[PDB]
Amino acid sequence: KQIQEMKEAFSMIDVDRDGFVSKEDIKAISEQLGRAPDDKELTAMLKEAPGPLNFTMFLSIFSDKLSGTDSEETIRNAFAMFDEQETKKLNIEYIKDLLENMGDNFNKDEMRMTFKEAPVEGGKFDYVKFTAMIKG
């Protein structure tokens, strides 16, 4: 189902419906929606694919991105590992503290980028809903 989308996507992106994605293909659709990348962005954006962009080298680079990651269960647990009472929520000051200056310290940006999305309401940061959002 990750594929079914990829295709239908490649379809909407491949404007000149020629089964290939060209600098004009990308630029084209981007603009039809939101601001689009500059030539340099579009250039190196394609150079990321050895040869022509058939629906194959497409699924290839996309799959090689999302590779090297774990489970929604494996992560939801690394979380409940600080959820002693098993409430399915972490107190915001806590989590922020963990990530911020513990282990492999994050940075303010990593910190902002991360919480700009985070689902915190009532002081408690729901790591379930957020594990989903970050995953499937």
Binding site: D70, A78, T114
Partner: peptide
Amino acid sequence: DQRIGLSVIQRNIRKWL
């Protein structure tokens, strides 16, 4: 356990980031 459970989250958020 928490040292691992944190490395998961730390490395796996930096990814989604």
